[PDB]
Amino acid sequence: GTPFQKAAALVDLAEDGIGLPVEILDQSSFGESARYYFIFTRLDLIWSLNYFALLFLNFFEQPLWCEKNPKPSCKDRDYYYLGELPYLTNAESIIYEVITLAILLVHTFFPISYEGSRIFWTSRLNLVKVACVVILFVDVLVDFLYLLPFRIAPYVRVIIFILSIRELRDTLVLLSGMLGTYLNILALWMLFLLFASWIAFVMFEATQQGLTVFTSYGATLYQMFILFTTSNNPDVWIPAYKSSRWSSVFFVLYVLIGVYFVTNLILAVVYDSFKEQLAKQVSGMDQMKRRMLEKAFGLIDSDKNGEIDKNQCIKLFEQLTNYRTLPKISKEEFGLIFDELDDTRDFKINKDEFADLCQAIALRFQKPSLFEHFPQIYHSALSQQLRAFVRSPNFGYAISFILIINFIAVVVETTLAIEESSAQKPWQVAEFVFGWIYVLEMALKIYTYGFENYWREGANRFDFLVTWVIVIGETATFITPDENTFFSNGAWIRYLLLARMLRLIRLLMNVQRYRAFIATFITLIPSLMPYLGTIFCVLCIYCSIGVQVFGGLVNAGNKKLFETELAEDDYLLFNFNDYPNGMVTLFNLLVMGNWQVWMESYKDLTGTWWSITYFVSFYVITILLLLNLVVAFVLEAFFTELDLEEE
Amino acid sequence: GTPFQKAAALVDLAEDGIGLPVEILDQSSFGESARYYFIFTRLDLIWSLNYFALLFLNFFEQPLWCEKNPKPSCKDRDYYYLGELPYLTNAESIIYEVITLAILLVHTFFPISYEGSRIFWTSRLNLVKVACVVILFVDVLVDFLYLLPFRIAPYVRVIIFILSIRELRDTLVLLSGMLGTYLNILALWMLFLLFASWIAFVMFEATQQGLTVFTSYGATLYQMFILFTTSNNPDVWIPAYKSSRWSSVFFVLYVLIGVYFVTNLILAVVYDSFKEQLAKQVSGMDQMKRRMLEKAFGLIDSDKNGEIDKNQCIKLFEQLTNYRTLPKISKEEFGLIFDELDDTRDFKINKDEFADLCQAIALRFQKPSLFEHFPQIYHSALSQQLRAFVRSPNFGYAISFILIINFIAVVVETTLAIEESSAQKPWQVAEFVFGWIYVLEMALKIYTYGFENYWREGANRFDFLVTWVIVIGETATFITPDENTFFSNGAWIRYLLLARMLRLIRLLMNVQRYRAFIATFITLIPSLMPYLGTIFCVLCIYCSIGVQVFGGLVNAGNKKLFETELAEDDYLLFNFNDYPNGMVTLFNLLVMGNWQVWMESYKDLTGTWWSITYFVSFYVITILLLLNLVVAFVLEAFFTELDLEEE
Ligand SMILES: [Ca+2]
Ligand SMILES: [Ca+2]
Ligand SMILES: [Ca+2]
Ligand SMILES: [Ca+2]
Ligand SMILES: [Ca+2]
Ligand SMILES: [Ca+2]
């Protein structure tokens, strides 16, 4: 047991909670565990692809109501308002499930090799993983034997995907703590709805608005709930306004208080409670991080001198460079990290000074040209003029001028979109020239800045990709002037025109005051993914429930469907017949635009009032809790960055 | 010229920028100005009532399109979908205008008495006031002579009302300061809209969604703006979804990015700019206050010793107690404030120590019973038992039990809302007893805590007034069992139930966590008044413009009206025919619920595309600027209070 290997393992554990068990580093036969751990970590791309394949299977499964015998077979894609995604047959679904299940089974039960026996079977996460895998295997076996109330696999495989990502696991734990305070503010919100309905039920008792809308307290409470979202504001109290113009005062007060006071109060409480959960998690994670780093320091210094020498600190680096979960470190970066690590400036790292290792590792990002091989070409009299001009401030001025000319060429080309293909070639030739100029621009930039220096920053790598993607398509259209099924097609021409448009957005980066706002938007999406992924997983669960409950009520032969608001508004294509169909239907309810049409219509098709619990719970869980959390993220991101420049 | 009088005037100026001119305190004949200033300030209630009456005249004026000769006379209130507020005849309008104009003219030109001659005519605010008064007088004279393109008096009197209140003027100044940054963010929003519209127009060129919705670039931009409002989300791209389910991805991306990113960025920018404006205004006002207080202190101390004695300070107190714009101060409050002001504890107030006078004045609010006159009654064994019981914690428990019994009685009474008046008498008697026992509670509370100590708090006064208002109504209903036109009416019974339900709301204060939120809302309402008044004035201006432009297009005989979205949705009662009608029509656009129905319909009635400039500018000015500001205020208040409790 080499102490440096254990120190590297402890550093890997300190970077994030994922790693080797703590109690096996000093245990005998540790290398046999490290080897299997490295082998397991070499296949993380395969594991992630398998998990995404399991997640994306719900989109391609035949709906459960098709497993029965409807009067027309559901291959009639127009009768049920289905569309555009194929269904997997029995053989295809069976083989896909078998392959994915085998890979998942290998992934789940492999940690037992480097975790021993008792440690694997005493972890709650491993226990729930094994339980989910066993449930999925039993479901697959039952399905194979049949070829049953309902198919439970869709829910299970979504759960497996959620717990397979560390960020998705963390979000659910945080939401668990919020559940106490969130339920508290829902009771206050519920009391406001309950009493406001009581006032409106007795006020409009014998009036015209109580004989058609507020027929009973349940009807009143139902209508006052929708009014709280301002989805039917003028519609609901037309009869009250037609019989008395003073009745509008009550509804004006209710909407104003409901929207500005109550709705904003929920957002403030949700964000405040969630922000408290970060403090508990971050402090706990950081406290664990420093404990692991401190323990690693003790292993390295067996002499108890208190500090590590230069070579000993270096020897740690090549031991921790075998891990793929740690930032890449070069050979010359070894001194760079040690130079930056030293805070007391004594050629030695201290115990409390060593606790800033993980932050130090991924902070260097610096440092030399391959065009310096021949000094008779690069160092020329005319070369300096080119070198001066490319680095001159007018270089951007010239490129901006070219972009403006390109902008003029694009807008005039889009104007002649109804003309035939006879006059499109002259503009194609002009666009052909514009493609190579930008390639010439980026190639010239490589000649001056170098190759490796040109590739260091991540933003330029995106510019490298988009420049090459658009030029190969542009030149492919020109080198093939005869008729083709891939270059003269209407779809290909449209894609070409869009590509040049997304090139023109670069002009918007010239405005510094606008460029800052775009940069904030770009840097926010990576940090918003775990919360956006949770919303996607919640939609997946709700989509599976919607298909199983509201399966085939929207047909071309239903009689009660054409009397509902769904048919009158021509929303028949937004149903819960498919998984893709229900995935975009839940997006329409996500934005709360005409959202009560589906809630009203599916209540009539099911014929029961219990069906509205599907939509009420979706609004409460997703709109009020998850979307309000995402909204609060965008505000806090802008508020901190905006105030930063004035400081 | 008594120096204490000038010191009191300077303190009045320090409290707020409204007061006597600075350069007349040392000028000769100062008392002749102070007397007129006090006389002017004694009539502030009359001035405020006159200003509010002038503002409220727009609601009672006959619309200008009625001044012409429509085919039916507009006394037929149903033909034009008018309703419920009377029109002032020529004589009534003339006399009301004369009275208001006379009072306003007296108010405007009275300051010239205590401001001299040259000072009055060199102030920009006074010049604007005089110009507005002259314009209003000219309009009144022209109207009298006639009995003309249009009447300008509505806008002028709205402006007069706006500039007659300091808070509205401050809000306007801050908005003028913000205008540049608001335009800066609007330009980026417009660029985003234009780019998205270009992409959508080109990409759906020859598709079914481009032959019915995106017919041209202007129509595409219009529909993309409405979609950014998310008022027609599923409707706009139904043809695209019907021809290709993958087309929904573009619209999903547009809606998500637009709404979240752009809306929250605009809100953040507006809030940041307004906070900067608040910082500037507060800094300037505080600097002016300190300068005025320093000048007053310099005036008081003519001996240049550096500190003021006690008697001189008390003399300042009863010299400044003559102003009605300053907080009330009693006799012992003189010594109380003198003791509280002393920070160095030396029986003397210092130069910088005196600058904390305005804050100290309205901070005492303390300090004794009138029931102590007879010690043979108040001091008794049973009296002691009652005093112990009322102040005991079980007093609240018993009152809560009584209120719960009242809740049961009220709910069972409301259950039998369809029954006749024969069985309502027992419940009327029960609620009669409830009202009297509540009055007994209030009287006993007065008896135990005293009279003045009971009247010190404000919520206690509110409880007193509401209890008396409900009990007088209950007893008036009970003592008249025979048929009456005021006590057996259904409206009276409904009012009684509504009054009782608020008493039933008193129980909501028992929950501490809900009581904190309610108190936060209650203390938030006063601080939001200037912004709500600014929104109200903007709504008044827009209503006047809408009545002037969209006057009588909504009739019962129009042919192009029944083909519009206004008639199909049965929104015909929400038009711009009246001032009351337009005032509630603008509220429907305020909440952005089905808001494009009016924008679509009036474009067809006017027959021009310029009419949408009325609705777009309303959305930009009101929804994106003022309502966002109110929302930001609510969020920041809730956040600060919340974070205050965990601290
Ligand atoms: Ca790790
Ligand atoms: Ca050492
Ligand atoms: Ca050191
Ligand atoms: Ca004053
Ligand atoms: Ca003195
Ligand atoms: Ca002192």
UniProtKB/Swiss-Prot annotation, chains A, B:
Main location: membrane
GO BP of this protein: calcium ion transport; calcium-mediated signaling; regulation of jasmonic acid biosynthetic process; regulation of stomatal movement; seed germination
Cytoplasmic side: 1-44, 115-131, 166-184, 270-391, 450-461, 510-520
Phenotype reported upon loss of the gene: Plants display an impairment of both the Ca(2+) inhibition of stomatal guard cell opening and abscisic acid (ABA) inhibition of seed germination.
Protein keywords: Acetylation, Calcium, Calcium channel, Calcium transport, Ion channel, Ion transport, Membrane, Repeat, Transmembrane, Transmembrane helix, Transport, Vacuole, Voltage-gated channel
Ranges of residues in domain EF-hand: 288-323, 329-364
UniProt-listed Pfam families: Ion_trans
GO molecular-function terms, A-Z: calcium ion binding; identical protein binding; voltage-gated calcium channel activity
TM segment ranges: 45-65, 94-114, 132-147, 148-165, 185-205, 249-269, 392-412, 429-449, 462-482, 492-509, 521-541, 615-635
UniProt protein name: Two pore calcium channel protein 1
